[PDB]
Subunit: 250 residues, 6 copies
């Protein structure tokens, strides 16, 4: 193996340059399946890697696990192996009342509520998605008919306090984050997730194309924790779009 964590070699990718990077390792095969010649490459820690084929070209699907740090690992090592375009596909909670469960969100840039982005660029550097990628995602989403929102995302190092969830063991939120969701709401931020800040920053600052898309599985103006019932029906929606977007980016 050529890299410390992913257990992959440059040869495994077969000249692949684009990677779809889901968070959950169980979604990896699920995504690979949407393409041709799906092959499992490796599985170590939270990192599961498949190769597949898109219009006759090699494509990598690789999980990041939850959060900046492990994302920063998968991205770095995939880059070492030759990946130049990263498309993230996620699940998110919307914080605007007009965004519905099932809606697809394309992120233009992220509020940096993470730590890892700082290890790549100072806070003043914009966690902005690549223009070609965003265009690919926005268009892909149009062509499959999904009801889509394009905007800024709050990308947090936690699932609980940083997203101002109170229904927690301690039931307090550090002062810094108290009332933070209302502020993000006022600034028109669409949603919370946990990886885009690191992903987008580290790519934007190292000449790597990144895009970010997610399916809404809970609206925060209503609940803190999603219901299981239509979580999978929304997943299948955004996956379709990211694969299509990838097609457009090859």
């Amino acid at each position: 193996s050529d890299v410390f964590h992913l257990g992959l070699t440059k040869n495994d990718l077969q000249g692949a340059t684009l990677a779809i990077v889901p968070g959950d390792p169980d979604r990896v095969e699920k995504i690979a399946a949407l393409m041709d010649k799906p092959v499992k490459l490796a599985s170590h820690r939270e990192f599961t890697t498949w190769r597949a084929e898109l219009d006759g070209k090699p494509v990598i699907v690789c999980s990041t696990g939850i959060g900046g740090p492990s994302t920063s690992i998968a991205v770095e090592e995939l880059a070492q192996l030759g990946i130049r375009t990263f498309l993230r596909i996620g699940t998110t909670g919307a914080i605007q009342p007009h965004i519905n469960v099932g809606d697809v969100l394309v992120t233009t840039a992220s509020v940096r509520l993470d730590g890892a982005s700082l290890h790549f660029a100072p806070l003043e550097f914009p966690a902005v998605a690549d223009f070609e990628c965003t265009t690919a995602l926005v268009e892909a989403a149009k062509s499959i008919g999904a009801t889509t929102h394009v905007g800024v995302t709050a990308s947090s190092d936690t699932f609980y306090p940083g997203q101002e969830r109170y229904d927690t063991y301690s039931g307090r939120v550090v002062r810094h984050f108290k009332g933070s969701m209302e502020e993000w709401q006022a600034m028109g931020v669409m949603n919370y997730e946990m990886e885009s800040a690191t992903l987008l920053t580290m790519c934007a600052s190292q000449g790597l194309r990144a895009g970010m898309v997610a399916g809404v599985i809970v609206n925060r103006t209503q609940q803190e924790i999603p219901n299981a019932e239509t979580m999978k029906q929304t997943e299948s929606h955004a996956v379709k779009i990211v694969v299509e977007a990838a097609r457009r980016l090859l």
Copy 2:
């Protein structure tokens, strides 16, 4: 007059909702002329305002003067008067060796080296341009054939130390900014200018559409101060694009 600085009334705009916002007040008529029925509306301090018509729809051209603060005034007050889309047209110095004098730069987001953005959103908020505006600019620039670069811009509160110019009265640059240009260069930042950070941040955080385009008049890998000779030939290039982008956004 309805606003403190601009000396305009909601009636002057005639239902206009888009504004082209150049920095130099002398470029205002220059731009307005490219359109139909150009009329001077007002001129106070650095703020010169003209109205014109684009495909039969009222459009404002309004100067911001140099820097975040006065920009933040022009934008605020134009918003009060009903403007919802802001297109900035500027001049810039490129910091990448492959970007040439005469090239047109479309900004996706900005490195926040300003003060005013902070008065609208904390530093972690992305100074990101509106997706429709950027698309309009990128496309406009393609249709007029201009050689174009799309990416991140360093937006600085100073023309001298913050852009690491040393040929200055004191000839020193505060520690914070020493070697800063090399760092921005490595992160692929295209250029320095002085208003995009404020403009984009205040718009992105208040539900206002903003776009940013500039003409390159100096390459910093070569000189600190531009030559006068082809400065006007590049201005005329980006102006053409911003007006055309505006057409697309009406």
Copy 3:
């Protein structure tokens, strides 16, 4: 021309070493007129420059436009041309209930709510006015009988949120500045304006003498936006003082 923005040559100044720097370019001639042999030198962007004579010595009047950035340009380039003493004359909103419209404020040092000052010195460096200049201003104000307050000023990169004005397009103030006016009030800050922080910091940290005086045209405990009626009667007051202070500093 010898400098990039002002369009002036070292020869234009005729050995001048002091500059009166108003914010509004229309106030430039107005001030120059109070002196002998007033001559227009240049006008580019927000920068209008006149030369005049005070007690047989050359004096420059030059506008900065609104805010740190452009101020930082005018100051730098005037320094390049040989100016060593800068006297700013401005308009301001008082935040203490005992300071009245018409009163003259002499600033000893500023609260740094700007960006540009940071490009000259870290935040811990005091935005402090030159002792000789302050003394000149305080005394000049005494001799013309004006009712004067001496103290700290809050110098903000915005006119709106940073001065906690709420009667704005969005009507919200970023968390950082919420209740900020009350705090400045409690700390005895006299007033808000937009340039002194940059001006004082960049001068104090580069061996240049700077002083700062302004006329009060609105009290914030009463209104957010000034009335037009006695705005000009107060301007004429502070102008008289700055010119007299200049006489004392030659």
Copy 4:
């Protein structure tokens, strides 16, 4: 299931109050096996949970995945389910030349180079391990004869730039972290890892006992990336200690 991520119910824990939390999900069973009645409870994303018995008392083993964010999830949800003591067992790189591969490190407190800790307490709050836990670890390590070092750990949101690794895709380290390893070395920091800062801070600030122990698998004064050969022999060492320390904490 009672929690959003782990897929566990309060009933599954059977009144357990202590959890051993390794990072790699494959180490989970490995650790559970060292105890009585090992049972797999759940496996979702990077979170694998086993229950086992220690001196006739229920104990949880649960993986965190790499980094603060996912750790912060595992800990929160285990706390919801009733866990009050958390013992981390990890792998680390030593940065002091006297610490050898194979050595066991007990962490008293951590240098907060992470993002998640901030979501629990401001930076000034010490990322300090619980005194009872530390004592348990230190003593456990003494009784099994391991050669042990007790001290401060640098806990980083990245594996690469934040640990000043240069043998990377871009081969640059953001200015902030340049020469950072030498600084940590001089301050006597033992090692780099990625979770302790979040773990310790969130526990210390929410009345939860936490301890942190790791096995050294590379010395950074020598290499950047570990060799595979004795990586497993060191893992088995620290695991023995954490289980023993757990015994002492029941």
Copy 5:
């Protein structure tokens, strides 16, 4: 004399390597008296130094005065003279309702609300006490029967606003600290004092052993200012413990 402030020579210490460091110079002899062969060495500014003997070994008692800065002097210069272990004995105000006047607090680590610690290590470095010293203190306290609490301390550069005391000349607390005590309470911080942050940080980052113990003389859930009546009875309690802890550390 060998050091600038303490007025001591390496010879005065007679090979002493441990120092008990009270804050009040009048407590110095009081402490020295509890040991054998008490001798006054020097008294300059707030720094009073005595030598005594513990189990036939030389021990220094030396006052720090109130606060980080002077503590940082005493510690530095004692280290120059060869002291390697520093035990601080203090007085403190508890902020938890269950901690009583008379209770003894052993500090594991400190919330850094000081300035001097920053001069030794960045804020992310933990202000953590030495493990051996803490153990010595905890055990010493057990053996003399005192009712003891072990945990984190808030260490503040002020006695008044930084500890959110309002019964002051101005009766306001700067925004930063408003409601800060409640937050520290919620995070389980035991108490306020003024030196541990500097002491612990400077020692932890320079390979010097430090410990911290204090007597509670006021509970902040009840009063702001202590009563004089049982202040001395509590002092005598913690002193006994620190001397005993020293015995264990020789």
Copy 6:
């Protein structure tokens, strides 16, 4: 007694409103002696207080000890007892080559390298001396013929690293302060001392008049540690000035 630390009552001051505040408690009587009817009031910890008479009016002399914290105590409690004007008299190390041992420095404002100032006002607030006080000091110094420099002072929470002294136990200076003295030098900062930042900030933000004067006892371009020989001859110089300045402020 009316205050927690100083051991004074409002009655002891006898309607005094001005205080001279030296750092060293042994300098207190020395200063009081220069005036009429010198009486010792109290001595607790580093706080020694004398009353004397100046032109038939009561004046307090009170020591602060070294550093912000204890200064912040003395000042607070003196204010509670009715003091409104504080004159600090100190010793300092010059960092400019043209300032000589024996020279007197009057401080207009301070670089905030302390912690306590933050407990009174955010960093952006200027640590500026009161205009009347500075004028009194400057004039007093003129009238006794002393060779005087007026300007900004760097006020540090440490004597050693924060003033970039390297001849120390560890011989390293935390990154933050590496090369800091050169930077302060370039910005024209005159000197290092340890109390002015706290003193000036807490007074300027609470409507209390403060002034700051010090004698130079070492030039840092030459040595790190002063020589004892002419240390007292310089002390006697600045003391004379502060007493005179006080006369002018009654």
